[model samples]
Target: AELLLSDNEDKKQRIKEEKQLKLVKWNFQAPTDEHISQLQTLLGNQAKVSLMSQLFHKDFKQHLAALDSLVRLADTSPRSLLSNSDLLLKWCTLRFFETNPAALIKVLELCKVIVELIRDTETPMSQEEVSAFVPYLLLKTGEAKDNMRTSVRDIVNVLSDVVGPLKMTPMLLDALKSKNARQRSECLLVIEYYITNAGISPLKSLSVEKTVAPFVGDKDVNVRNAAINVLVACFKFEGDQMWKAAGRMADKDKSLVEERIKRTGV
Candidate 1:
């Protein structure tokens, strides 16, 4: 009876400590250096799932001490630290999808750190590995609600900066065909935002016409509007190549013309 009672008390203390740790994480207040170091030590030693459950809980603070520690490690740690740890990838990916704009900013900074850390490492990131991170970031950008304008724009900026890899090309092109029309529109908006803001030519590589063909006639006005805006921006900034390519595809798809005329009142 005495042994059983002692074990029960030990379990209770462990649970209490876990809950307190979770509470401290949930509070959005910026963590002190000590707090950040403690989290880094914990994340390095702990199981990823449990740590993630705590870090990504919906009520998890938009800003946490843990991110600073991650950022610190990103600067000092070898890329191999992340190379072997899929959990780190998962957590960094979560930053891209975080609803808070402030959180997204920190996530972007972390991504930059990841890129820099990997640049010199012998571990060549496979296209698949790169895509693994890029696709979700792009998808999250596409799915973001416009009401979250700053956050959405932050994602757009990041995508613009790193849109070069060919692996990301096909994934983004397919985003236009997603069953979610809003997602398609946001994809277009992001593309246009990239072209306008980053001055990066989205066209030198992936064919936008091929990308937008499936959605040109989407029933949703928002999707149609998004397509038109992308078309116009392409014409305005990228010239007639995108327009000509799209016109060729639209010739056979009358719904495309019809939707265009409807939206333009022409």
Candidate 2:
């Protein structure tokens, strides 16, 4: 009872110290209702992005409520969050492949939000930023389960709208060499999409001969077929160089490549 009657300034200071100690001790708890409400209030304020950046430093487990708040904010003001793409990417990469399913799922969910944000834009993303984003997506694609792969692919598809397929060729070409056949095939499929949708100009810069030639004889039929289709697509754009490169292969593979090229009639 006496404590309730204590000097006002002393009581206020003591309460402030207690709250600080509580935060320091359990620093990673999920965002409180107050935090979510505060974030919503900040959404239209000048401090929105600054507050969002602060969320990244908090523990991933503590992010569920924050993530909810962000999604809600994004639904109403997507451009505000979209304009902060650099910060969003940095935040996700900070714990890119977390082992904890709960945390990892949230990261992936947030990734989709960012991808959608960019996809809806007419403005071109910085090439450097897109380059970094490609590797991160590929890394996740290589490790994700089948269902998750679909989500990653969707994100990549949206990203393609901003960065263009040609800018992504180098990374896709690199993926074609992965020891994991699935990764190799996935790259080919995405390349095929680019060829069909974006045309072949972007791919002309890639080393048509070196990148797709060896896959012609891959042990996996799907890999071999994907390789052939990619080569055919390149031949349509690259012509003589692609043809001469195929001609240089060993007789057995060369016959197969020639036959495949003949069928394409390009």
Candidate 3:
């Protein structure tokens, strides 16, 4: 009876200590050297899976601390956390938009790590899993901040490489239809990236003609340029089919297509 009572008291003390640790503000903005030392020491001993679990904590502040620590740890050994892909996916899916700018940036960095892992191996991520997140990534392409937009662009390209451009077409098309000009522009840009970088064949699976047709005359010059580029790339890959579609298009759209083809000498 005495031993059991002592054990219960020890457990309560541990609980109190953990509660205090959670309540402690690590002050990321201006962490003291002592605080940094503590963070580094604590994170060094924690397993990557444990760090990821902390990252998915219910409290926002705890999540931020976990992210900061993970980012720090990643600076030396990025692949250490690759096994946490499923958790990373869940983190990005549920908590991405809810995070502050600092935490969001860290999450994006973590995404880069995951993408690198995917590319470096035949890790076998499902098309369904990849498809679910592509839209969120597409939405980030239009993020107001340049760094955030660039980070998403890089990760999106890496993911596209893993899942292939075919799986991403629907989300790209959906973005093209968005009322936001930035969204439309970025989506068209991604299409152009797919054609230019991934080759023009994957786009053949999508309704290339219907998708690029309206954007040829878009008021936004960026969208118009991206649309024209897609047309040019498609013509290079499937000139006969593109010519047939061009023949059926409105005169203005047909002219844009013809002009782009002529310029590209394809």
lDDT of each: 0.52, 0.62, 0.64
When summed lDDT is taken over every stretch of 10 residues in candidate 2, the lowest stretch is: 1-10
Give me candidate 2's TM-score against the actual structure. Answer: 0.67
- Clashing pairs for model 3 are none
Clash pairs for candidate 2: none
Worst 10 residues of 1 by lDDT: 1-10
lDDT (Cα, tens digit) per residue for candidate 1, span 1-266? 11100111122332355456641331212224554444445444443444344464555462354466566655455443444333344466656544666666666666656555455443345443454455565555554456454454454454444444344446666667567666677767766655555442645566765566546567887777776666655555556565556655545454554455456544
Show where candidate 1 strays beyond 4 Å: 1-65, 71-87, 94-126, 142-149, 163-168, 194-205, 237-243, 247-266
True-structure lDDT of candidate 1? 0.52
147 Cα displacement, candidate 2 (Å): 1.8
lDDT of 1 at 118: 50
State the local distance difference test value for candidate 3: 0.64
- lDDT per residue for candidate 2 within 220-240, as digits (tens), equals 887787887876776667676
RMSD in angstroms, candidate 1?
13.2
Q: Best TM-score goes to which candidate? A: 3
Instruction: Quote the lDDT for 222 in model 1.
Output: 77
